[PDB]
Amino acid sequence: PYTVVYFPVRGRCAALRMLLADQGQSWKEEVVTVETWQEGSLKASCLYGQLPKFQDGDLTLYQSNTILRHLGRTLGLYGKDQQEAALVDMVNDGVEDLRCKYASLIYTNYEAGKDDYVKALPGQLKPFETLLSQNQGGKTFIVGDQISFADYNLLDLLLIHEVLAPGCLDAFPLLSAYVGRLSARPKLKAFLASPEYVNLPINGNGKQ
Amino acid sequence: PPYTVVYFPVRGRCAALRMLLADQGQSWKEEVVTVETWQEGSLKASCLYGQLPKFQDGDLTLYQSNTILRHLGRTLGLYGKDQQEAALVDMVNDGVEDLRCKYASLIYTNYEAGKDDYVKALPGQLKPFETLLSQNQGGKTFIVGDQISFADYNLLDLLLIHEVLAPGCLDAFPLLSAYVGRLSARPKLKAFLASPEYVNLPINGNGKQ
Ligand SMILES: N[C@@H](CCC(=O)N[C@@H](CS)C(=O)NCC(=O)O)C(=O)O
Numbered sequence: 342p343y344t345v346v347y348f349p350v351r352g353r354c355a356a357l358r359m360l361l362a363d364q365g366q367s368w369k370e371e372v373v374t375v376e377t378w379q380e381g382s383l384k385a386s387c388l389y390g391q392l393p394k395f396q397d398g399d400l401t402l403y404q405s406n407t408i409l410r411h412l413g414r415t416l417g418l419y420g421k422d423q424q425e426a427a428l429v430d431m432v433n434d435g436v437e438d439l440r441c442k443y444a445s446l447i448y449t450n451y452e453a454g455k456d457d458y459v460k461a462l463p464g465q466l467k468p469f470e471t472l473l474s475q476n477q478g479g480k481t482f483i484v485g486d487q488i489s490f491a492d493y494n495l496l497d498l499l500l501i502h503e504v505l506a507p508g509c510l511d512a513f514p515l516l517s518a519y520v521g522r523l524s525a526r527p528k529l530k531a532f533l534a535s536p537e538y539v540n541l542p543i544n545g546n547g548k549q
Numbered sequence: 550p551p552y553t554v555v556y557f558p559v560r561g562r563c564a565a566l567r568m569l570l571a572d573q574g575q576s577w578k579e580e581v582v583t584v585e586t587w588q589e590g591s592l593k594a595s596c597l598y599g600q601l602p603k604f605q606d607g608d609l610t611l612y613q614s615n616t617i618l619r620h621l622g623r624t625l626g627l628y629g630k631d632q633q634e635a636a637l638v639d640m641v642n643d644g645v646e647d648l649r650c651k652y653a654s655l656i657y658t659n660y661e662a663g664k665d666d667y668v669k670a671l672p673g674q675l676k677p678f679e680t681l682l683s684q685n686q687g688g689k690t691f692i693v694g695d696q697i698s699f700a701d702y703n704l705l706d707l708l709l710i711h712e713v714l715a716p717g718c719l720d721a722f723p724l725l726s727a728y729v730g731r732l733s734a735r736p737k738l739k740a741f742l743a744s745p746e747y748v749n750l751p752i753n754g755n756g757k758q
Pocket residue numbers: 352353384390391392393403404405406643647
């Protein structure tokens with residue numbers, strides 16, 4: 342069984358939660374309040390002084406993308422071969438890059454930086470549209486014909502950007518259809534509709 | 550060679566993967582991209598995320614430095630002995646990437662104003678890797694398990710460039726210090742690090758270090 346240790350926010354656990362839900366995996370949520378975190382003891386015990394912390398039986402992991410890659414590896418969501426595995430990494434690293442830019446905006450420069458960020462957004466999303474266009478016309482997944490951890494990470498990136506800049510996918514038919522298609526997967530649909538997801542803020546500072 | 554590295558004339562985000570290839574006795578081609586060629590725009594427009602490095606393994610074209618590291622890691626058997634070790638290797642590399650991003654931000658956006666604060670924060674940033682070494686065979690081997698991983702090469706570069714930025718930063722970290730000496734002494738890697746191919750490239754693209 343799995344345990345997710347995190348703040349009461351979607352943030353960097355959103356993608357891995359979607360993965361677990363869609364894959365019909367059970368997990369426990371250990372919700373850490375800001376007050377508990379500010380006490381200091383849990384933070385000091387964390388490898389890089391940060392969350393998420395993740396438990397897979399006796400194995401304890403840190404780093405959101407390590408968790409995603411671990412679940413991808415152990416559950417067979419990492420491409421069909423080494424070639425696809427490399428492409429999956431390439432997508433995920435791209436998602437991470439834009440997530441970092443997004444987080445920087447949200448937490449450090451929302452008011453002054455939003456206009457420039459949204460203006461630059463089309464150019465940041467186009468690589469993912471291009472990737473879909475080059476994989477079976479964008480009719481399946483981001484890499485190959487089976488779902489990967491990168492799909493869940495990209496899906497979250499796209500969902501949070503729809504909130505930040507409504508209509509940001511309108512120019513991108515493959516990304517638009519991809520979001521709708523993945524979101525309609527029965528277990529994922531149910532999770533995305535649940536208060537467990539809906540009633541958490543996207544970020545920790547009330548900005549989105 | 551089956552491998553091609555496409556990059557600016559700098560060490561930067563290719564240093565670790567080059568060390569990996571050299572230490573593993575692999576052949577590769579270097580394709581150098583000048584400031585002018587980059588400013589022209591055509592190569593940049595053709596890159597997936599508009600950035601370098603670009604890497605070729607036969608007809609497989611990759612972008613993203615850590616994607617290249619993981620690809621070489623998997624293919625050359627530098628990704629742990631099993632699934633659990635693979636996760637630990639990823640955990641290390643993600644930590645290295647996190648600090649590398651902070652390093653790059655200092656170098657390229659805020660060197661003069663940010664250096665003092667960065668160097669003050671540095672011991673707290675390096676400590677986790679010392680901790681990991683201490684919990685793995687007393688720090689006498691590698692960062693994860695008893696065989697070298699792509700994370701070792703990435704960590705090694707991170708440590709080398711930080712010793713240039715903050716001389717003596719590893720004085721506080723005996724295991725990290727010995728680790729750098731040990732890995733740097735690996736014969737193929739030692740030869741590569743001493744070679745014009747490595748030495749005559751700057752660490753960064755703006756002449757800061
Ligand atoms: N590279 C890390 C970063 C994790 C991170 O930024 N953690 C934040 C929340 S998403 C945190 O624990 N902030 C609290 C702190 O640093 O004190 C990952 O992917 O997990």
